[PDB]
Amino acid sequence: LANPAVPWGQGVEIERALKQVQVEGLSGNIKFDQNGKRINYTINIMELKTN
Amino acid sequence: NSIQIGGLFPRGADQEYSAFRVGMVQFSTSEFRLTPHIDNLEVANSFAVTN
Numbered sequence: 001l002a003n004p005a006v007p008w009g010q011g012v013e014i015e016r017a018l019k020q021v022q023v024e025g026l027s028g029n030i031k032f033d034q035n036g037k038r039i040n041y042t043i044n045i046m047e048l049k050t051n
Numbered sequence: 052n053s054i055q056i057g058g059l060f061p062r063g064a065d066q067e068y069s070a071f072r073v074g075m076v077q078f079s080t081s082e083f084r085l086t087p088h089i090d091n092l093e094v095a096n097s098f099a100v101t102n
């Protein structure tokens with residue numbers, strides 16, 4: 001809350017580090033855009049049947 | 052009989068603060084006097100509001 005807020009420099013670098021990652025996981029292909037939203041994912045379309 | 056009351060005016064709000072001061076002048080009384088502390092901020096900003 002101390003005003004004016006001063007951010008640490010490292011933070012931006014950590015952000016870039018996190019956003020640049022591309023890995024394989026339980027959610028499928030994991031990659032992010034500049035805003036942090038998911039990209040290149042796969043959403044399986046499923047139907048409930050008798051079997 | 053000084054009454055401390057905080058206030059928050061979004062930057063770019065003028066007539067509101069004007070009518071606020073006019074209200075302070077007209078409704079002023081000998082019994083007690085309100086003592087506002089004005090701080091202008093970005094109303095959409097949650098951090099600013101919290102601070």
Ligand SMILES: *[C@@H]1O[C@H](CO)[C@@H](O)[C@H](O)[C@H]1NC(C)=O
Pocket residue numbers: 039040041
């Ligand atoms: C990966 O996802 C992004 C975001 O939708 C898309 O623009 C891009 O074409 C995708 N790449 C491939 C190879 O599907």
